[PDB]
């Protein structure tokens, strides 16, 4: 998991705004992984999602309806997840 996610983030950074064309393929799976992954890596996924959103800016639009729900479901007042969510 970790190496694959890091590779995807690197590719998006290297491509620049050209990477927007890949959102229909990546996001529908990435969010599902967040939904079903183990807690040990969910925090990492939130941090990488943060960076991904930063890279794609206003094109994230159609996915916010689900991103906000994932953010609310896991906001359990645990200091670590709170810091990660606040940065996100």
């Amino acid at each position: 998991h970790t190496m694959v996610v890091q590779a995807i983030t690197f590719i998006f950074k290297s491509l620049g705004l050209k990477c927007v064309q890949f959102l229909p393929q990546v996001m529908p799976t990435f969010l599902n992984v967040i939904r079903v992954c183990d807690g040990a890596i969910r925090e990492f996924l939130f941090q990488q999602l943060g960076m991904l959103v930063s890279f794609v800016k206003s094109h994230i639009r159609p996915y916010m309806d689900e991103i906000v729900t994932l953010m609310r479901e896991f906001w359990v007042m645990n200091t670590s997840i709170q810091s990660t969510i606040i940065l996100l």
Binding site: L17, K57, S58, R61
Partner: protein, 49 residues
Amino acid sequence: MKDRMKTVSVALVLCLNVGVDPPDVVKTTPCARLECWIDPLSMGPQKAL
């Protein structure tokens, strides 16, 4: 109000190069390219202008 200077002429200079996106344009889904309540894509590059 003795100073009654008035506008006599208006110059309309348009650079609406329909069909061409400058390289610094971010596109496209929310672009809402509606100008003077016209959507240029339904008419073509000359009629729309």
